[PDB]
Amino acid sequence: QFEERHLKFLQQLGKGNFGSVEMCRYDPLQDNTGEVVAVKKLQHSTEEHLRDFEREIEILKSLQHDNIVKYKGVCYSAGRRNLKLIMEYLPYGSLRDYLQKHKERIDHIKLLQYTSQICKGMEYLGTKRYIHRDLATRNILVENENRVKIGDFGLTKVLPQDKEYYKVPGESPIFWYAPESLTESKFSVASDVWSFGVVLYELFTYIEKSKSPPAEFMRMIGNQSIVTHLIELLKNNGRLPRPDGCPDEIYMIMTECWNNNVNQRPSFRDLALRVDQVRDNMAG
Ligand SMILES: CCc1cc(O)ccc1-c1ccc2c(-c3nc4ccccc4[nH]3)n[nH]c2c1
Numbered sequence: 001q002f003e004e005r006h007l008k009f010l011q012q013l014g015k016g017n018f019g020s021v022e023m024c025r026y027d028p029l030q031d032n033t034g035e036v037v038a039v040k041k042l043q044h045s046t047e048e049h050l051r052d053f054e055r056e057i058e059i060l061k062s063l064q065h066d067n068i069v070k071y072k073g074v075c076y077s078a079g080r081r082n083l084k085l086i087m088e089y090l091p092y093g094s095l096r097d098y099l100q101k102h103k104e105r106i107d108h109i110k111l112l113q114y115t116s117q118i119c120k121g122m123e124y125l126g127t128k129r130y131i132h133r134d135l136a137t138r139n140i141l142v143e144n145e146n147r148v149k150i151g152d153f154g155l156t157k158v159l160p161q162d163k164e165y166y167k168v169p170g171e172s173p174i175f176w177y178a179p180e181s182l183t184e185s186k187f188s189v190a191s192d193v194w195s196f197g198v199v200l201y202e203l204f205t206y207i208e209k210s211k212s213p214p215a216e217f218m219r220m221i222g223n224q225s226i227v228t229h230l231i232e233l234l235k236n237n238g239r240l241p242r243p244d245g246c247p248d249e250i251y252m253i254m255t256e257c258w259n260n261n262v263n264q265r266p267s268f269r270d271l272a273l274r275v276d277q278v279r280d281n282m283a284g
Contacts, residue, residue: 001073001074001075001076002026002072002073002074002075002077002084002086003028003075003077004075004077004078004084005077006026006027006028006030006034007024007025007026007027007039007075007084008024008025008026008027009022009024010022010023010024010025010036011023013038013093014094017043017044017170017171018042018043018044018045018046018049019040019041019042019043019053019154020040020041020043021038021039021040022038022039022041023036023037023038023039023089024036024037024038024039024086025037026086036089037072037086037087037088037089038086038087038088038089038090039075039084039085039086039087040084040085040086040087041082041083041084041085042082042083045081045082050080050081050083052154053083053085053154054083056085056153056154056156057071057074057083057085059130059153059156059158060085060087060151060153062128063128065120065121065124066120066147066149067117067118067120067121067124067147067148067149067150068121068124068125068149068150068151069087069088069090069141069149069150069151070087070088071085071086071087072086072087072088073086074086090141090142090143090149092141092142092143092144093141093142094137094138094139094140094141094142095114095137095138095140095141095142095148095203096136096137096138096140096202096207098142099137099203099206099207100206100207103206103207106206108204108247108282109279109282109283111203111204112250112275112278112279112282113146113279114140114148114203115199115200115203115275116272116275116276116279117147117148117149118135118140118148118150118196118199119196119268119271119272119275120272121149121150122135122150122189122192122193122196122268123268123269123272125150125192126189126268128158129158129159130156130157130158130159131156131157131158131159131166131187131188131189131191131192132150132153132155132156132192132195133155133156133157133187133191133192133195134152134153134154134155134156134173134176134195135150135176135192135195135196135199136173136176136195136198136199136202137199137202137203137207138152139151139152140199157187159188164188164189165186165187165188165190166186166187166188167184167185167186167187168185168187174226174227174230175198175213175214175217175230176194176195176198176199176213177191177194177195178190178191178194178195178258178262179231179234179235179260180262181194182227182230182231182234183231188262189267189268190262190263190265191262193257193265193266193267193268193271194257194258194265196257196268196271197253197254197255197256197257197258198213198240198254198257198258200250200253200254200257201213201240201243201254204243204245204246204250205243205244211243213240216240216241217230217233217240220233220238221233234260235260237260239255239258240254240258247278247282249274249278250278253266253271253274253275
């Protein structure tokens with residue numbers, strides 16, 4: 001339990017429509033310093049967003065894995081109605097920024113180390129029947145040069161006991177969404193795997209602006225609405241191209257994640273083995 005008065009503001013870390021993230025020092029003895037944490041609050045405190053936020057917290061609360069970011073607590077000092085979530089602070093930020101600034105020290109082998117760690121996380125989420133729903137390079141955090149961790153779990157949904165998909169706004173990362181998520185609003189491990197396919201695309205393009213999924217899909221779309229154009233482009237087997245210099249065996253994994261049919265997509269266990277193996281062939 002974190003008390004507002006001891007929660008000292010250092011700087012803004014990242015923002016969005018109704019949530020924001022701040023770097024903070026939690027200083028219960030005020031003497032003169034304590035421990036640095038990442039703090040999420042809601043801007044527009046609508047009750048659906050609050051209820052969604054409270055459900056995000058329970059998910060975070062239930063997670064313990066070396067490749068998943070650590071929950072520390074919550075602050076109720078000033079209300080329900082302005083809850084704060086408190087998580088560990090990882091200094092190197094998101095994989096999107098990190099990769100983009102440090103790229104010339106990061107080769108295909110490093111990129112495959114990151115990929116492995118991502119699959120181990122999603123494996124572990126699969127065990128708890130969680131569908132992350134926002135797998136993208138911008139929601140993977142870097143603890144150090146040899147370790148990254150998932151999370152922005154604000155879209156994460158728990159699977160029903162009886163079903164293997166979840167039916168569910170507001171801004172969606174459509175260019176990372178699988179076809180059945182666009183057309184029918186279904187989410188599954190299968191759709192999480194599709195997203196991972198495009199994460200693999202992001203890393204192997206080195207997050208170059210002009211090569212990005214929005215950048216690329218919008219070129220192919222040419223030339224309403226935009227989703228409707230995407231859904232149709234995907235149905236005619238339109239896909240993100242092979243990144244320059246991307247291996248055969250990696251590109252194949254991408255292509256397999258982006259299979260129209262849910263049931264023919266690879267599983268995260270399989271993706272771990274395949275990627276862990278490609279590393280060794282590349283190294284030794
Ligand atoms: C508290 C919000 C949240 C809520 C979830 O459900 C899951 C993860 C997070 C989260 C998001 C971002 C961070 C960061 C960080 N460190 C940076 C350095 C530089 C630039 C950006 C950074 N973001 N550390 N820990 C973080 C936890």
